[PDB]
Design a protein around this motif. Structure first.
Motif, short mmCIF file in Angstrom:
data_model
loop_
_atom_site.label_atom_id
_atom_site.label_comp_id
_atom_site.label_asym_id
_atom_site.label_seq_id
_atom_site.Cartn_x
_atom_site.Cartn_y
_atom_site.Cartn_z
N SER A 56 0.84 -1.19 0.00
CA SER A 56 0.00 0.00 0.00
C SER A 56 0.88 1.24 0.00
CB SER A 56 -0.91 0.01 1.23
OG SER A 56 -1.77 1.15 1.27
N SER A 57 0.54 2.19 -0.87
CA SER A 57 1.24 3.46 -0.94
C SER A 57 1.21 4.18 0.39
CB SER A 57 0.59 4.35 -2.02
OG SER A 57 1.27 5.60 -2.12
N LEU A 58 2.24 4.96 0.66
CA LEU A 58 2.28 5.81 1.84
C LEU A 58 1.43 7.07 1.65
CD1 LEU A 58 6.11 5.56 2.59
CD2 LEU A 58 4.26 4.13 3.50
N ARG A 103 -4.10 3.12 -3.08
CA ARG A 103 -3.34 2.63 -4.22
C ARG A 103 -2.56 1.42 -3.72
NH1 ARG A 103 -6.12 5.84 -6.16
NH2 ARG A 103 -5.83 7.14 -8.02
N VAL A 104 -3.09 0.23 -4.00
CA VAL A 104 -2.43 -1.00 -3.53
C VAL A 104 -2.24 -2.02 -4.63
CG1 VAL A 104 -3.60 -0.69 -1.25
CG2 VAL A 104 -4.26 -2.60 -2.76
N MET A 105 -1.30 -2.93 -4.36
CA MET A 105 -1.01 -4.07 -5.20
C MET A 105 -1.04 -5.28 -4.29
SD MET A 105 1.91 -2.58 -7.77
CE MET A 105 1.69 -0.92 -8.42
N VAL A 106 -1.67 -6.34 -4.78
CA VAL A 106 -1.91 -7.53 -3.99
C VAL A 106 -0.99 -8.65 -4.49
CG1 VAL A 106 -3.64 -9.27 -3.33
CG2 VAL A 106 -4.32 -6.87 -3.72
N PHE A 107 -0.17 -9.18 -3.58
CA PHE A 107 0.82 -10.18 -3.94
C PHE A 107 0.60 -11.48 -3.19
CE2 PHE A 107 2.95 -6.17 -4.77
CZ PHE A 107 3.48 -6.40 -6.03
N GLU A 108 1.20 -12.55 -3.71
CA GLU A 108 1.28 -13.82 -2.99
C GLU A 108 1.94 -13.61 -1.63
OE1 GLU A 108 3.57 -16.09 -5.78
OE2 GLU A 108 1.78 -17.08 -6.61
N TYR A 109 1.47 -14.32 -0.61
CA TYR A 109 2.04 -14.25 0.74
C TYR A 109 3.08 -15.34 0.92
CZ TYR A 109 2.36 -14.71 5.85
OH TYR A 109 2.82 -14.75 7.15
#
Length: 277
Positions: A56-58, A103-109
């Motif tokens: 997530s963006s700051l 503004r987020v990007m979702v990734f594998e954990y």
């Protein structure tokens, strides 16, 4: 039978997620995995059961977000959408929402944290020889795939802090930083990470002369492998270690023209480890 002419009146292949879905998935962003220079990392679980790491963006207001930020955000997503490698921390989705600003990007954990943590943090579980070879090979296969696709921007921050480990300690190279290096430089970085995996040692600054002289002593023939190789590995095969140290030496040559290509590194690494993809 007569003309009736009108005119209408008023960008990637991974899913858009609603903020509401991510709020649920991440318990309203209350579970922190970590942080970088451009982002917070939150733990979540999608309704499918798939665990996620959400970058997530700051930035906390639309007033602080530029058209360039937006452009680099979409560009990163488009480029990572073309990577789906077993040894990459793959992009699973994204979320843009204006209210509130998101503004987020979702990734594998990756449940077992970073390579840096496992190599250097005293309370972290130490990795044996086969685990280290598996991680080394996984990294090489990812970097080779990355170069094959022609998408090196994803490796601009590559080091042991950006390699994550799966539940059985396989490597996942990551690119979590928001986008705001030649392949010869990535090859050098690979050599340094391989050296770190083998020795358990890392430069303590940009000018680590003592470490340079110590490594130099090995390559000039003045050091036994028992002094070089990380004691926390336990037992290791001597000649395999030698061969891997030759790979390191080729990769970290000060003259970029003398370094091998990543495809050659991966081929050599597979020859040495006998570990397939």
């Amino acid at each position: 039978s007569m003309r009736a002419k009108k005119m209408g009146t008023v960008v990637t292949g991974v899913p858009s997620l609603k903020r509401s879905e991510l709020e649920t998935a991440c318990e309203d962003f209350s579970n922190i995995i970590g942080s970088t220079s451009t982002c917070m990392l939150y733990k979540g679980t999608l309704s499918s059961g798939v665990e996620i790491a959400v970058a997530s963006s700051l930035v906390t207001s639309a007033k602080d977000w530029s058209k360039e930020n937006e452009s680099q955000y979409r560009k990163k997503i488009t480029n990572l959408s073309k990577v789906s490698h077993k040894n990459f921390m793959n992009l699973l989705g994204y979320c843009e929402e204006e209210h509130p600003f998101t503004r987020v990007m979702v990734f594998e954990y990756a449940p077992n944290g970073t390579l840096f943590e496992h190599l250097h943090v005293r309370e972290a579980e130490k990795l044996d020889w086969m685990a280290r070879l598996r991680i080394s090979m996984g990294i090489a296969y990812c970097l080779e795939h990355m170069h094959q696709l022609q998408t090196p921007a994803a490796l601009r921050n590559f080091d042991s802090t950006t390699v994550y480990l799966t539940d059985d300690f396989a490597a996942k190279v990551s690119d979590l930083e928001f986008w705001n290096p030649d392949m010869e430089d990535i090859v050098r970085k690979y050599g340094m990470v391989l050296l770190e995996i083998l020795t358990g040692r890392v430069p303590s600054s940009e000018d680590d002369g003592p470490l340079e002289n110590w490594v130099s002593r090995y390559f000039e023939g003045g050091m036994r492998l028992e002094e070089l190789i990380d004691p926390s590995i336990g037992f290791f095969p001597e000649d395999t270690a030698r061969a891997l140290c030759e790979v390191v030496r080729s990769c970290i040559d000060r003259d970029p023209k003398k370094r091998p290509q990543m495809k050659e590194v991966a081929a050599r690494m597979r020859e040495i480890t006998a570990l397939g993809p």
